[PDB]
């Protein structure tokens, strides 16, 4: 029974290490009923919708083609949630392809597997850049 705050901090550390160390390895963090948004746009101008399923999450990650992503974490706030879950709020700056950093907004929902102790998986993940909304 670890502290949600430390659980969220360690999860964000691992997630943003794996984002650039191995972007194609990111799908292992999610599960069956898992959502995913990473701040996309289209012709209509509306932000991109979510995708569900591990395969769809992996395909979306490869489409977004994260290369050498650099992340500065300005804030992490983790709290307890149903089924001993953890809700994580992430405030930071993200830069893709070594380009200009953009302020980014992130909400993780991590749920226990229920089979292994302290085993968490990313049930939900929402991401959005500041410039694309404000």
């Amino acid at each position: 029974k670890p502290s949600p705050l430390l659980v969220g901090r360690e999860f964000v550390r691992q997630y943003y290490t794996l984002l650039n160390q191995a972007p194609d390895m990111l799908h292992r963090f999610y599960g069956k009923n898992s959502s995913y948004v990473h701040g996309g746009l289209d012709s209509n101008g509306k932000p991109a919708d979510a995708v569900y399923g591990q395969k769809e999450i992996h395909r979306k990650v490869m489409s977004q083609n994260f290369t050498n992503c650099h992340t500065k974490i300005r804030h992490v706030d983790a709290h307890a949630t149903l089924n001993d879950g953890v809700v994580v709020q992430v405030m930071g700056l993200l830069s893709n392809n070594n380009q200009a950093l953009r302020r980014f907004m992130q909400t993780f929902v991590l749920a226990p597997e229920g089979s292994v102790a302290n085993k968490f998986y990313v049930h939900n993940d929402i991401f959005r850049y500041q410039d694309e909304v404000f």
Binding site: Y30, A117, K119, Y121
Partner: protein, 38 residues
């Protein structure tokens, strides 16, 4: 034993534990050689 996303404990630390080196130099070999100069 705190682990996440079906990853073995310390799978990420072990993966990212390497340092930036060039050629066959061990980490800090160049610094050791230039340490001779004042």
């Amino acid at each position: 034993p705190i682990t996440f996303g079906d990853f073995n404990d310390g799978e990420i630390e072990s993966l990212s534990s390497e340092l930036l080196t060039f050629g066959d130099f061990l980490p800090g070999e160049v610094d050791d050689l230039t340490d001779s100069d004042w």
